[PDB]
Design a protein around this ligand. Structure first.
Ligand SMILES: [Zn+2]
Ligand SMILES: [Zn+2]
Ligand SMILES: [Zn+2]
Lengths: 530, 590, 186, 72, 187
RNA sequence: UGACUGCUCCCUAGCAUGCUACUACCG
RNA sequence: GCGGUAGUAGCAUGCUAGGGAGCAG
């Protein structure tokens, strides 16, 4: 413990935004039986919120994951990452955004990262870095309660990490992390806008000629508590693989050690006291969304490997594929060392019959249908089996959609539905969002961030630019929600200049704005060009 | 925040920080101020200063709009732009604010310091908004004045109740009563925590100071206190409300056919419901508080409050209520820390009375029915605003006679105040008269009203009593040791001590004389009932041993003598001071 | 900004050059005045440009300031805003159960703990006079929150279990009226 | 309709918050429960139930002088 | 930008120009005039040019220098506060019992999870229920981690002191429930 | 008491270029 | 009569840094 009395947390309600809502009903909304109706809200949480949540790590077990097939699908996954580059850098090359966030504990008794990124030379930071390549630095961590709109009354936590970790893991990974972030047209798609028809391009990629195509997604039940450790180490290793020159050996090994002490299983200053974090990842360090994606690919592959071998032997028709499977087993158990010929062969086989697009822990796979029925590509039931025997949770089948027509696109990826509609002359995919989200984000806020939009507006802009695609929808009330947001923004602005002309007659001398309360400024958005 | 131009009414967004009140000024009026007097500091949603790191400027003249901040001359980036501009100052309401031309008295109050009878008469004859403003900057001057003083530390603690103290190097030691309260610290370099409230009084002999402490901290030799103080707050209520008619008295039910000791009153009483508020001019103790009693009961059951300026005044008034009004519907309220112990015969401090009684010093801000104020001619316009705010009702009775002394105004030192200029309703009565009248007493002798009739009042004041010849003088002098702002007599009061054997009816007088510590030592003298001249007033008791000690103006004022003599039911002792005045009152001496 | 010295000179020079090229004259005087016109223009326009610039800077800072000021002060009156919003919202919602309790609470009766819902779970009412007692309490039954409570006690201010129709309006001044009644749900 | 019920509830719990009710505990518990519930309601009835079974919480307080606000 | 030698030269070039222009003479007079004025213009251009650059750059230098200064100064403040917190943490631990436990080491290395357990004193305990109460911290004392402990005070959620009496089985449903027992290293 | 990323809109300040006219300079 | 240079003001482009806000994981 530390204090002499524990601290209790609470999460206030959200606050209302009456007017906009009064507007909304005045336009004939929420008239009963509507197909749009509030559904996201600011849920409130009582006293013992944190620890009554951090308890969930008891969902995390030890595990032994089979060693041979792991020592192989790490190689295939590796092959998925041969188009980037990274290595150690130097102080004057890291790049921080919003260098003003928290700084974990106890450094948060003294100010944000302005100080520590400021009160240190570059040589300071380089001593630090090229120090931890030979030592260990156990750290702490804080747990924070998020306060933002939702749809399920549970808690939320985010692990604010202490500065001496990020301040190195950056230096050690930045080159790669960029190289991934800024490449167009591949598997991992972290960082590719959905504006200006980049979304449509994402799809017309992840199609790419697989013969009999069906679409399937899935989702991971409690993704970041239950991930066993072995897979976390596997992620960190596949990332460090490209460090073959900057580093050495013992440099790496201590660097891995410093990471596994700083994010995997170190103490957790939850509340006013210290615990231990037995395992599982931690959604706040320097290398998440990437590591989550990698792990995810590891699951998808392992599922396919099982789906292959599990199949009988003497019903496979394509003598080529039978000789594949056979060769596969041989390389997997009998052999000892890699068959680069075979590995390249496999990777190609997958790209041909099981293409996949990945965001950090959020997938879509387009796959060769009749194969599935023949079991040479991991249809869902294999996902049940893997999540079981090596994530030891149970992925219900009420969450993994599946799609046979490919026109009207997938079902939901990164929480947008995908309509296919006619732009100009041709046909493109616009992603549009669950309307209730847009509304129930209009009416509930923190305080001044709304309570009174007349100061703000800029929000209402961004919201409308985000709920434009709903103008194309064949349902009705949907398209309305756009025309609402419009006539709103307009009237709002009108009263603003009214006041600045009324109290203080200082009439504002020109317009320009009128592009806002007219749709053309938006739709230009979803259209390829600049 | 925002508001209106405290003078030009214009809604604005400035505060002349150079002021001590920092009020809301229109752009134009602010311009005129910052051009006129010395006040050169302007605040809005930030201050207007030389936001250069090193540069510091008071006025906003050489202040230039730089980028988005401000600068003096020396940092004016060439995208500059002066703030002070062509007879306006940039702020808000750029084009709305309408200036006003009482720049005159605006400067006159913003610059002065109540040194002047002129400063007062303007302050009590300026505009209403400026009237309250003058009022609060008056209290502000008062508070700064009180702040200017010094500190008291200990030489040694003689007793747990008796202490031996001193002050710092020279800093002025105030007078002595209970109106001087302190709070100390046992500072072990640190450990400087409040050690509680302590008031201080004269020891019984020599260098001694009797301290009453609220805490139980045993004081030692390395100990000290600070004279503790409040902080006055702004107000907003007008000093006066609109007087209007009705058709009659509607919505209430009076006392049909009341009585005879209240007979000469019901006409007046009904006049209550005709004028929106009412008042009474009358001679000192003239059925006056009696009249108020008969009126408040003239409506038998109502949310009534009896209240006045001082302690003993409202005390005797509420004993008067008691004496007439049924005590069962009566509650006398007193203050909290309440180091004063008073007539407390009802349910004390019991808030929800129907006939509530409390002094202004913390009149609980409530609504009521016809409330009366008593001794209007005492307090300041500030107070009248304060009570107007705290209170809500139907009819507001303000009784007084500015021939009765008013506030101490211990800042008012040179160039006294003149009658109506005491406060607003003083202007009312001195001009528009009272709202009712009755003009004779039941309460004081005839020779004594002959005394008071050639001095303060006119001979036109004629009471209803007789000469009982229980009024005698003297002119003898001797010791005047004096202490701090309250000088005493020893041989005059000792001749009084042997004189306590002279005439029987004088073993229950009241020791009165124009000094505080004088009457305080008077308890050490013979254990004689006493009263400082102010602690009397309006009342009427039988005998008063007046020992006019010193011969300063505060000691020989005609009005302080008059309020000493307007309270004698039966007679006066007064061993006089000014042979001119000593013969102005007409008795035998010895 | 059609009101500046350079504007005046511009106008004069324009007038002269227009008169000339209207009167017809030498190619050479054309060049004189045309240079002159160029001068007047290419300074007047500059002053007017920078002027409207400064004008706009002023307007922008002013409107930002207004934003900020009204913002903060609203942040300061959050409380009273909230409550008045609530009550208008409630009588807007209009429910005779809600109205029931609300009117009653303004009347005098207020409960002394969360009003529960089950058949069990007594509640405590505070009724402040006989008449206030007489309007709900009619026999041992009890309408409040449009719910039927049966009584199981009565007690005046100083905690004396005083019986049911023991008190009576006539003999009511026999009783401290801060009655602290209890009851249970139908 | 009911949608306004959910809204009113949000306003309301915000009020009870700022009245410093969270110095208790068990209060804040029962309240946050009623809140978190109606914000998943389904039929106006049991809503109105939890609504009043909350509101009275506030009524039992004495920070509000509702005899004022019912000025209309 | 007036105290410039070029300003003297351009100013005198004018002086002569209006001298021979008010006394307007010949095309050569006009020629000398226009020539001088064109070239003294030329002197003014660069002076009134580069000088702007010098000035603006001076100013930005002053800015950045202030900034560097403030940075280092706050670095000083942080180092101070850091060490002082460190030492106020330190001088509360050097119990002999530790020095014992570290001598007893095989090497001077002990895993951390058995230092606060064995060597530390004042114990806090959280409790969620009455049952767990009466099963684990019942009575006035108890052993745990193989050592005795004494109850001091039993505060609750609102930090209201609660005697060891009220905690009946049935006074329980009247309590904020996660009671904090502050026991002590009994010895 | 507020984590690591990624995509966007609006408003400044600097910069470079780039465009255009004026004016002066030399062929 | 034509080139280059020099300033000016205008317009564009981009890049920088600086704040304000929105979304997905
Ligand atoms: Zn001033
Ligand atoms: Zn003004
Ligand atoms: Zn300066």
């Amino acid at each position: 413990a530390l204090t002499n009395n524990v601290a209790f947390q609470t999460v206030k309600p959200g606050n209302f935004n009456k007017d906009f809502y009064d507007f909304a009903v005045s336009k004939g909304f929420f008239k009963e039986g509507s197909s749009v109706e509030l559904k996201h809200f600011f849920f409130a949480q009582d006293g013992n919120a944190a620890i009554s949540d951090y308890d969930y790590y008891r969902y995390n077990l030890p595990t032994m994951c089979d060693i041979r097939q792991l020592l192989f699908v790490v190689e295939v996954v590796d092959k998925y990452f041969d188009c980037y580059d990274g290595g150690c850098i130097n102080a004057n090359q890291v790049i921080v955004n919003n260098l003003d966030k928290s700084a974990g504990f106890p450094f948060n008794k003294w100010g944000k990262a302005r100080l520590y990124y400021d009160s240190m030379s570059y040589e300071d930071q380089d001593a630090l870095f090229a120090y931890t390549k030979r030592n260990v630095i156990p750290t702490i961590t804080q747990m924070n309660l998020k306060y933002a709109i939702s749809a399920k009354n549970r808690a939320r936590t985010v692990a604010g990490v202490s500065i001496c970790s990020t301040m190195t893991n950056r230096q050690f990974h930045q080159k790669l992390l960029k190289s991934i972030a800024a490449t167009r047209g591949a598997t991992v798609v972290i960082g590719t806008s959905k504006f200006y028809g980049g979304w449509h391009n994402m799809l017309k990629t992840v199609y790419s000629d697989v013969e009999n195509p069906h679409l399937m997604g899935w989702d991971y039940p409690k993704c970041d508590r239950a991930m066993p450790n072995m897979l976390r180490i596997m992620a960190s290793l596949v990332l460090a693989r490209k460090h073959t020159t900057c580093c050495s050996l013992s440099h790496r090994f201590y660097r891995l050690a410093n990471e596994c002490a700083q994010v995997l299983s170190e103490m957790v200053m939850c509340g006013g006291s210290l615990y231990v974090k037995p395992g599982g990842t931690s959604s706040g360090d320097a290398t998440t969304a990437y590591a989550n994606s990698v792990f995810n690919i590891c699951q998808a592959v392992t599922a396919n490997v099982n789906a292959l071998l599990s199949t009988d032997g003497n019903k496979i028709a394509d003598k080529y594929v039978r000789n594949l499977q056979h060769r596969l087993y041989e390389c997997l158990y009998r052999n000892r060392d890699v068959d680069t010929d075979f590995v390249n062969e496999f990777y190609a086989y997958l790209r041909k019959h099981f293409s996949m697009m990945i965001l950090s822990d959020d997938a879509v796979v387009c796959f060769n249908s009749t194969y599935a029925s023949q079991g040479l590509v991991a249809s869902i039931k294999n996902f049940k089996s893997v999540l079981y025997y090596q994530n030891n949770v149970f992925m219900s089948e009420a969450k993994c959609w599946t799609e046979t027509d490919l026109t009207k696109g997938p079902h939901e990826f990164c929480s947008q539905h995908t309509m296919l509609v006619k732009q100009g002359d041709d046909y493109v995919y616009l992603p549009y969002p669950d309307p209730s989200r847009i509304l129930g984000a209009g009416c509930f806020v923190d305080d001044i961030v709304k309570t009174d939009g007349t100061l703000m507006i800029e929000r209402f802009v961004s919201l409308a630019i985000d709920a434009y695609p709903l103008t194309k929808h064949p349902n009705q009330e949907y398209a309305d929600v756009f025309h609402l947001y419009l006539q709103y923004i307009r009237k709002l602005h009108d009263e603003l200049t009214g006041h600045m002309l009324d109290m203080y007659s200082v009439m504002l001398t020109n317009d320009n704005t009128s592009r806002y309360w007219e749709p053309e400024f938006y739709e230009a958005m979803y259209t390829p060009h600049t | 925040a925002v508001g209106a131009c405290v003078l030009c009414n214009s809604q604005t967004s400035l505060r002349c920080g150079a002021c001590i009140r920092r009020p809301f000024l229109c752009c134009k009026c602010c311009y005129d101020h910052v051009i006129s007097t010395s006040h050169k500091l302007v605040l809005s949603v930030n201050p207007y200063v030389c936001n250069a790191p090193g540069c510091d400027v008071t006025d906003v003249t050489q202040l230039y709009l730089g980028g988005m901040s401000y600068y003096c001359k020396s940092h004016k980036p060439p995208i500059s732009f002066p703030l002070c501009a062509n007879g306006q100052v940039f702020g808000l309401y750029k084009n709305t604010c309408v200036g006003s031309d009482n720049v005159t008295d605006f400067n006159a109050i913003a610059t002065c310091d109540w040194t002047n009878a002129g400063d007062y008469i303007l302050a009590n004859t300026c505009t209403e908004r400026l009237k309250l403003f003058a009022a609060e900057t008056l209290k502000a001057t008062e508070e700064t004045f009180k702040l200017s003083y010094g500190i008291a530390t200990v030489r040694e603690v003689l007793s747990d109740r008796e202490l031996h103290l001193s002050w710092e190097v020279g800093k002025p030691r105030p007078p002595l009563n209970r109106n001087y309260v302190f709070t100390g610290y046992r500072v072990t370099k640190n450990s400087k925590v409040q050690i509680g409230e302590y008031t201080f009084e004269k020891g019984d002999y020599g260098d001694a100071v009797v301290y009453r402490g609220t805490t139980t901290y045993k004081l030692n030799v390395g100990d000290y206190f600070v004279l503790t103080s409040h902080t006055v707050m702004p107000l907003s209520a007008p000093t006066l409300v609109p007087q209007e008619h009705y058709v009659r008295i509607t919505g209430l039910y009076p006392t049909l056919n009341i009585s005879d000791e209240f007979s000469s009153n019901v006409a007046n009483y009904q006049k209550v419901g005709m004028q929106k508020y009412s008042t009474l001019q009358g001679p000192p103790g003239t059925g006056k508080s009696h009249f108020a009693i008969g009126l408040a009961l003239y409506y038998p059951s109502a949310r009534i409050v009896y209240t006045a300026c001082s302690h003993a005044a409202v005390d005797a008034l509420c004993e008067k209520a008691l004496k007439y009004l049924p005590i069962d519907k009566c509650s006398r309220i007193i203050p909290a820390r309440a180091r004063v112990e008073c007539f407390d015969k009802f349910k004390v401090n019991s808030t929800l009375e129907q006939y509530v009684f409390c002094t202004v010093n913390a009149l609980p801000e409530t609504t009521a029915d016809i409330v009366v104020f008593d001794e209007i001619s005492m307090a300041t316009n500030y107070d009248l605003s304060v009570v107007n705010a705290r209170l809500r009702a139907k009819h507001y009775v303000y009784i007084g006679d500015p021939a009765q002394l008013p506030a101490p105004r211990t800042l008012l030192t040179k160039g006294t105040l003149e009658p109506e200029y005491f406060n607003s309703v003083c202007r009312l009565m001195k001009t528009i008269g009272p709202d009712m009248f009755l003009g004779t007493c039941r309460r004081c002798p005839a020779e004594i009203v002959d005394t008071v009739s050639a001095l303060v009042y006119d001979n036109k004041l004629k009471a209803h009593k007789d000469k009982s010849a229980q009024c005698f003088k003297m002119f003898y002098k001797g010791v005047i040791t004096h202490d701090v702002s309250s000088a005493i007599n020893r041989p005059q009061i000792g001749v009084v001590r042997e004189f306590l054997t002279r005439n029987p009816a004088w073993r229950k007088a009241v020791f009165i004389s124009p000094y505080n510590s004088q009457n305080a030592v008077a308890s050490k003298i013979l254990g004689l009932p006493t009263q400082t001249v102010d602690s009397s007033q309006g009342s009427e008791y039988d005998y008063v041993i007046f020992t006019q000690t010193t011969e300063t103006a505060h000691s020989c004022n005609v009005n302080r003598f008059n309020v000493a003599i307007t309270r004698a039911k039966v007679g006066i002792l007064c061993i006089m001071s000014d042979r001119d005045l000593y013969d102005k009152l007409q008795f035998t001496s010895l | 900004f059609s009101s500046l010295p350079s504007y005046a000179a511009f106008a004069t020079a324009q007038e002269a050059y227009e008169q000339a090229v209207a009167n017809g004259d030498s190619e050479v005087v054309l060049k004189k005045l045309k240079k002159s016109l160029n001068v007047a223009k290419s300074e007047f326009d500059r002053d007017a440009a920078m002027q409207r610039k400064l004008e706009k800077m002023a307007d922008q800072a002013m409107t930002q300031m207004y934003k900020q000021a009204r913002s903060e002060d609203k942040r300061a009156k959050v409380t009273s805003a909230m409550q008045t919003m609530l009550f208008t919202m409630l009588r807007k919602l209009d429910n005779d159960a809600l109205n029931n309790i609300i009117n009653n609470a303004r009347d005098g009766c207020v409960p002394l703990n969360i009003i529960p819902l089950t058949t069990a779970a007594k509640l405590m009412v505070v009724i402040p006079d006989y008449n206030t007692y007489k309007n709900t309490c009619d026999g041992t039954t009890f309408t409040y929150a449009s719910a039927l409570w049966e009584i199981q006690q009565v007690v005046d201010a100083d905690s004396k279990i005083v019986q049911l129709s023991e008190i009576s309006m006539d003999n009511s001044p026999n009783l401290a009226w801060p009655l602290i009644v209890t009851a249970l749900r139908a | 309709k009911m949608s306004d019920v959910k809204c009113t509830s949000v306003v309301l719990l915000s009020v009870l918050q700022q009245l410093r009710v969270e110095s208790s505990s068990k209060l804040w518990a029962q309240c946050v429960q009623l809140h978190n519930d109606i914000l998943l309601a389904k039929d106006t009835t049991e809503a109105f139930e939890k609504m009043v079974s909350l509101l009275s919480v506030l009524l039992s307080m004495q920070g509000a002088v509702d005899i004022n606000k019912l000025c209309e």
